[PDB]
Design a protein around this ligand. Structure first.
Ligand SMILES: Nc1ncnc2c1ncn2[C@@H]1O[C@H](COP(=O)(O)OP(=O)(O)O)[C@@H](O)[C@H]1O
Ligand SMILES: Nc1ncnc2c1ncn2[C@@H]1O[C@H](COP(=O)(O)OP(=O)(O)O)[C@@H](O)[C@H]1O
Ligand SMILES: [Mg+2]
Ligand SMILES: [Mg+2]
Lengths: 355, 338, 187, 84, 167, 119, 118, 84
């Protein structure tokens, strides 16, 4: 079959408009790969503008965008590598490894966006997860397959808590884990990868147990908005085909919803639902609903919620407060006293904390 | 003279049959799909808020009927619908199945089962949006129904057919009192007398599958799931599904109300119903009103909450009871929608 | 400068075409081509629906253009260029309007000013001729131009006329006069 | 340039709110879709692309370091606004 | 209505139907408030430096199909509608090197101190991507700011992005 | 009198756009009846968009409305039956008695938008 | 007066906020997209050239004395807030002291000047 | 048909308006008869300049026996009356 291709007509910042031919118009949430001199750039459709034109968001730096360049469709969403080979390698939202260690020869390749599990597949989790931390093992035990929330502000130690969780779980459990770095700092990213290398969870010359889905904030807002669902796709691929319990780690759900509202700001997306994003409910439920304890396996989603100066009035922290079942708030005041884990014994509740 | 005839003959082709064999009255071509919206030119015989098929699997409704394009709200994900797709009108206004088959089953804004236990055998199909009962065929709400919770039973008793509002903040236990009433109906729903029976229906507009699943599970643990009808338009579902689901449940309750039976509708989290309809209107070129809500959200809420009513003994004395909640923030019910 | 001012995208193409024809001094050829195209559109009602279709694709719009162009073998050296410009701009649903403003431009310069002598009853043809000569000899927009007044039988007029000519109407209708005494009577 | 040459550099981003306001003016004049507090869309992306450049390079890259010191001006101490 | 009106607006206001080779050149349809709209520049890049006939530089942020949106590097007085515009063929850059030390420079690198010209070891792109994830090192060398409080309780290290947020 | 009629062009929720002919455009606050299977629906005019089209507001639900549907012009504001026959009867906004007691046998129908008195 | 005459100019600009108010005035009808709280998008730039045209040069000096009318006494309003950063000496006339009896009303805290040096 | 009156928007002004109630256009609405005006003044008139203006020195007797007296109004002041 002839590759499906078109011409770029407009590029407004991170938003690129491409014109396609007759019967050549693709669907939304697809991949529009444009051969760029600075590597490879692919665009994802957000809405149809009519006149055989599609409004897209750049998944990679918009440097060098010229109207009329040949952009070829991939036949769907940009498939990311999924499989055991992805473990120990940082994978971005575009599937092109940023570790210069060779392409990930994954078993399969799944699109970022997929139908969430049906209502029957939904179930509750009532199994204890061994995290290796006394306070959170006793007072607020984790749920195997549930949605955990790691609240905390700035300088409280959320990301280090997440990486310690991955290390302890990998040491105490052979199930694979995935860490999506939505809104992840590059210096923090280098720290995370160095810690993963030094802790033995990531073995370059052997078998690893955690795959990074780092977001790399300096990429356009679409990458930050979709790294979360990329890591979620990795998690569900690990859960379904392998049939093992996996550990989904959201770097910052607040950054995910901020990036969603951001990409809404680039496009029309007239904010109506909460005020800053009208779609927020739709994609937020699409993401959260996809982490489900299906009959194949269980995915435990440990998301970190960043509250700026306790901005509970904003609907964004409350939306995350609605999803989770057990909280692990990391109030800074406790860390200022000397207990650097900073988890509040009285504010970190657990749903499954019962006799 | 021969050349005009030849060009008239050859004009039939090279035009993708947009005018020939289609007439653009029951069919059309989508100009562009947006955020749950597909603008399509044609459908000269389209009806107001009438269902339409996109020839892809997803449904749609022509809530807006602009002369240049028929604004259709997508009934599902907007991924599978593409610009230029050939659409076909269903020929009927948006309607959902109604009957006793939905008892002990799950449904959605379109009335289809989500858990997939089996096909729905509802005895009849009623329109999603029907006119409220008239001023004459109604009676004063007099049959009492016990709530279970003392704080509402002994202080603000809800009557059979009264549209009482249990309004609260983000975290106030509105669903808790709703489930309290649902489980208190078990005392009479396991009996024989239909007058004391109350087939309750609960809406899950915009509520994620996790919370709805936990609610259905804890409802099943009390063995009260049999006499309760559960409709769900989840957060993952598009905003049009969230907008329709309360109307679906309105039709479900009206089926029991017009059949002489007593039904209870609990319009859980109608605030996100209001915001979903606001999103649909703002995305449909409708003029914004107060708090960016369209001026017809009050129209929608009036139409929805007037369905639940106590009919006279002429109509079998069936009553539909409404218990919506409004998830206000900060206790400020002074806003426009509350 | 074009003879009259046109506004909106439905009319910008008309004045652009008139300016282009002024350079080549072929306004009559473009006018005749436009009349032939709209006659062909009227000949096939389906073709008119084809033009008004906004969903019709670029190749399909181009094919419609070659259909309307192959007949008469060429409408004009420039109006076909305007048609293809409309195709690449997706403006085939307004060609009747563009022809309308191009015609208005034509009578604007060719001395064919139009008037609307509206009356409650159809105008008597002996009285019709009296109206033509007086306004033709008058100086109301008079610089050596002809006149094309036409009777407009409307119910809004109680009786009389509203002689309309180039942004000039006379309040000589007896309906407006009998009302004008009413407000002062109700003082 | 100093960072890639093995030298240590310190950059201070004084009045980043002024840059945000200038970008807002540019986007609003260009009829780009406005966002929160009328700020432009790709403003967080702008700030990330500007700030993530400054870092500490590895030994194989010359062991250079670029220290970023962004400065913003709050409106009445409100750190809850978009740019803050 | 047999013939409805559905058109909204089009950036093309002058029907030419001829003329070509405007890939590298263009004409300013509208200019004001420090920004300009130019039809043409088909082969121009995103925010690529573009030279006007009056000498004022520009940046191509908006690239809509009708025209390319150009923001002006100065006042809009010198630029008028219909003026010829030409591509510079390169993105905006800035002189860099050790000679920048001891000089005050403009945002474009022009020395505004008035103490002579500027000597730079080279020229680097203004919009340079951040360093990759792998070529990074943990922040361990401190930056001695001098004030006791910042040095002690909120220390700054080399390569660390520390925000000084204040009223 | 001429048979004034229009064609539906847009249905903005409750708002309905109807296209009339030359001089057939009714004024604003003018009832526009449309024959519907669920009874009788009329619309009052509030805005004149132009191009022989008038924006109207429905007095009831616009269910089942189709583009090109014939719209009949009453001639003035929404005339409602008046007189002693309307006492003790439930009459809606349009004027049709909704008390299920039969039609109102009123000999007059005064328009709702009557001219207010002078100062 | 500063350049040609070489004299110390005591410029007394009265209600300089009206310049930004008129900029927003014309901006609404100029087609500009309104900025935050409805101000003109180009407020910062145009007021920047206007205020930077006031400076102490080698030829002379212009001692501009500007009074800024803060809308609703809200110092976070964009125009007065940016005028704060685009000005050396600040004298805030708070209403809370004006009605307190000290009608000079110079709030002794936000009224700051760069001359406060030992 | 929209005929233009040929003049800027005006309103009757003069001593005959005393004892008479008129609308915005100046037409008599009280029904007491026609309005006798010395002339017609534009509804939109430029305010007097600095020199034509004079310092407010002539008192206006408010007759309120309140702060309206201790702090007066005077002839020519636009003294506001705010409140709910
Ligand atoms: N339990 C801990 N043990 C040692 N150091 C910690 C611990 N928690 C936090 N830190 C330090 O505090 C810093 C917090 O960084 P990070 O967690 O990325 O940001 P935030 O605290 O805002 O989530 C880290 O650089 C880390 O060195
Ligand atoms: N009457 C009650 N008794 C005990 N717990 C309650 C009660 N009402 C609410 N809760 C608590 O509230 C939580 C659920 O709140 P929810 O009903 O979802 O609030 P909302 O109805 O505002 O969404 C439960 O965990 C439960 O412990
Ligand atoms: Mg962190
Ligand atoms: Mg609830």
């Amino acid at each position: 079959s002839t590759p499906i291709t078109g011409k770029v007509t407009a590029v407004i910042g991170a938003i690129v408009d491409v014109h396609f031919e007759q019967s050549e118009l693709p669907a939304i949430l697809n991949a529009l790969e444009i051969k760029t001199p600075q590597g490879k750039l692919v665009l994802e459709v957000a809405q149809h503008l009519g006149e055989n034109t599609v409004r897209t968001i750049a998944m990679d730096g918009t440097e060098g965008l010229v109207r009329g360049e040949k952009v070829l469709d991939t036949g769907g969403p940009i498939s990311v590598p999924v499989g055991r080979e992805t473990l120990g390698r940082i994978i971005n939202v575009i599937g092109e490894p940023i570790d210069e260690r060779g392409p990930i020869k994954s078993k399969l390749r799944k699109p970022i966006h997929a139908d969430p599990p049906s209502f029957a597949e939904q179930s509750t989790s009532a199994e204890i997860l061994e995290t290796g931390i006394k306070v959170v093992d006793l007072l607020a035990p984790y749920a195997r397959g549930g949605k955990i929330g790691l609240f905390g502000g700035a300088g409280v130690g959320k990301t280090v808590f997440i990486q310690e969780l991955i290390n302890n779980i990998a040491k105490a459990h052979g199930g694979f884990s995935v860490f999506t770095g939505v809104g992840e700092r590059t210096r923090e990213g280098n720290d995370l990868y160095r810690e993963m290398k030094e802790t033995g969870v990531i073995n370059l010359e052997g078998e690893s147990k955690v795959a990074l889905v780092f977001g790399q904030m300096n990429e356009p807002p679409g990458a930050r908005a979709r790294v979360a669902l990329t890591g979620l796709t990795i998690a569900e691929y690990f859960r379904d085909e392998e049939g093992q319990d996996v550990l989904l780690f959201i770097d910052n759900i607040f950054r995910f919803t901020q990036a969603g509202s951001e990409v809404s700001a680039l496009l029309g997306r007239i904010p109506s639902a909460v005020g800053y994003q009208p779609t927020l409910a739709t994609d937020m439920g699409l993401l959260q609903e996809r982490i489900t304890t299906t009959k194949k396996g269980s995915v435990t989603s440990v998301q970190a919620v960043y509250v700026p100066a306790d901005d509970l009035t904003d609907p964004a922290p409350a939306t995350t407060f609605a999803h989770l079942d057990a909280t692990t708030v990391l109030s800074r005041g406790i860390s200022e006293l000397g207990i650097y884990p900073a988890v509040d014994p009285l504010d970190s509740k657990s749903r499954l904390l019962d006799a | 003279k021969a050349q005009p005839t030849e060009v008239s003959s050859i004009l039939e082709e090279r035009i993708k049959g947009v005018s020939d064999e289609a007439n653009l009255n029951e069919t059309g071509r989508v100009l562009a799909v947006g955020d749950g919206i597909a603008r399509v030119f044609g459908l000269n015989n389209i009806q107001a808020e009438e269902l339409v098929e996109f020839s892809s699997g997803v449904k749609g409704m022509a809530l807006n009927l602009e002369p240049g394009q028929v604004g259709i709200v997508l009934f599902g994900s907007d991924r599978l619908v593409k610009e230029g797709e050939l659409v076909k009108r269903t020929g009927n206004i948006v309607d959902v199945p109604v009957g006793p088959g939905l008892l002990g089953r799950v449904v959605d804004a379109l009335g289809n089962p989500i858990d997939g236990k089996g096909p729905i055998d509802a005895a009849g199909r009623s329109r999603a949006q029907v006119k409220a009962p008239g001023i004459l065929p109604r009676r004063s709400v007099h049959e009492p129904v016990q709530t279970g919770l003392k704080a509402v039973d002994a202080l603000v008793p809800i009557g059979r057919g009264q549209r009482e509002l249990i309004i609260g903040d983000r975290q106030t236990g509105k669903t808790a009192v709703a489930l309290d009433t649902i489980l208190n109906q078990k005392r009479w729903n396991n009996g024989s007398d239909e007058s004391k029976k109350l087939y309750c229906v609960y809406v899950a507009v915009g509520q994620k599958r996790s919370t709805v699943a936990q609610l259905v599970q804890t409802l099943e643990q009390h063995d009260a799931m049999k006499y309760s009808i559960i409709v769900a338009a989840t957060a993952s579902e598009a905003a049009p599904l969230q907008y329709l689901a309360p109307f679906t449940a309105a039709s479900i309750g009206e089926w029991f109300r017009d059949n002489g039976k007593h039904a209870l509708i609990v319009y859980d989290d109608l605030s996100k119903q209001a915001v979903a309809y606001r999103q649909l209107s703002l995305l449909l070129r409708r003029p914004p009103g107060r708090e960016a809500y369209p001026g017809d959200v009050f129209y929608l809420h009036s139409r929805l909450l007037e369905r639940a009513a106590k009919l006279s003994e002429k109509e079998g004395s069936g009553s539909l009871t409404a218990l919506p909640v409004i998830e206000t923030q900060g206790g400020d019910v002074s806003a426009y929608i509350p | 400068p074009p003879p009259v001012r046109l506004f909106g995208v439905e009319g910008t193409y008309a004045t652009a075409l008139y300016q282009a024809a002024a350079k080549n001094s072929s306004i009559d050829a473009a006018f005749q081509s436009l009349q032939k195209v709209e006659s062909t559109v009227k000949k096939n009602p389906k073709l008119g629906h084809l033009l008004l279709n906004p969903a019709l694709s670029l190749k399909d719009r181009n094919s419609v253009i070659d259909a309307i162009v192959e007949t008469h073998k060429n409408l004009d050296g420039y109006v076909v260029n305007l048609l293809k410009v409309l195709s690449e701009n997706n403006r085939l649903g307004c060609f009747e309007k563009i022809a309308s403003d191009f015609g208005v431009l034509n009578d604007a310069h060719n001395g064919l000013l139009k008037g609307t002598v509206t009356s409650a009853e159809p105008l008597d043809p002996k009285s019709f001729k009296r109206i033509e000569k007086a306004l033709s000899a008058s100086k109301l927009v008079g610089q050596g131009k002809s006149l094309k007044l036409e009777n407009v039988v409307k119910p809004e007029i109680k009786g009389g006329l509203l002689v309309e000519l180039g942004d000039k109407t006379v309040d000589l209708s007896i309906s407006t006069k009998i009302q004008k005494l009413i407000k002062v009577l109700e003082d």
